[PDB]
């Protein structure tokens, strides 16, 4: 059967989490509240001990990173490290050259993408 009769009280079983968890001392009278108030505020893993340190195994948020180019703040701080012409990169609000097609009614498409939605585009491009 896919029609299941049972109190939906079980879809949220509370046996593992009583109020003891969110209110740590409620069997005393004092209503102190410890809530972990999001998934956002997670600090990170931390070792319980000096003896069993966290293993170093990387994710794609680390294992893929490039070498640091000096940004504008670093060269301001310490001009000693501006050594060459490649450091002299312009205002950070320059993204780069125009890399794609701005296609009417569909976004910015990609070069070598679908031209199915370019009709108005191609026609606009040749010019009470």
């Amino acid at each position: 059967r896919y029609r299941l009769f049972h109190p939906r009280r079980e879809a949220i079983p509370m046996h593992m989490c009583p109020a003891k968890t969110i209110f740590p001392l409620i069997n005393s009278n004092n209503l102190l509240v410890k809530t972990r108030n999001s998934w956002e505020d997670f600090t990170g893993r931390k070792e319980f001990d000096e003896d069993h340190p966290l293993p170093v195994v990387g994710s794609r948020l680390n294992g893929r990173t490039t070498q640091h180019k000096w940004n504008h703040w670093d060269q301001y701080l310490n001009p000693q490290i501006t050594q060459s012409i490649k450091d002299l990169t312009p205002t950070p609000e320059y993204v780069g050259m125009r890399c794609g097609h701005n296609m009417i009614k569909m976004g910015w498409m990609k070069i070598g993408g679908s031209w199915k939605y370019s009709r108005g585009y191609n026609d606009r491009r040749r010019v009470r």
């Binding site: 740590p24 005393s28 004092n30 319980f48």
Partner: protein
């Protein structure tokens, strides 16, 4: 290292400073007492976790009104920290 169910005693400890933060100190004292006996048995001499938990124990005594108890305990913390290889920089700070 000799087996101790550190998961449960840790549980017991966190419950401990929930008691402390909640303002009832005698209970935090009892809890820390247990946890301290456990760690005391589980780790070798002058290990960081030992000196940590007996810092907390010192703090619990102090709040209850056992002052010389707190004193003695925190001095044990210090002369332990000195005898350690390379103590946690946060621990010496918390300690003193």
């Amino acid at each position: 290292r000799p087996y101790v169910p550190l998961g449960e005693v840790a549980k017991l400890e966190l419950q401990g400073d929930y008691y402390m933060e909640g303002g009832m100190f005698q209970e935090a004292l009892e809890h820390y007492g247990v946890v301290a006996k456990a760690y005391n048995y589980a780790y070798p001499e002058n290990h960081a976790q030992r000196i940590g938990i007996r810092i907390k124990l010192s703090a619990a005594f102090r709040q209850t009104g056992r002052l010389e108890s707190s004193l003695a305990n925190i001095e044990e913390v210090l002369r332990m920290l000195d005898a350690s290889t390379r103590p946690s920089l946060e621990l010496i700070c918390e300690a003193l």
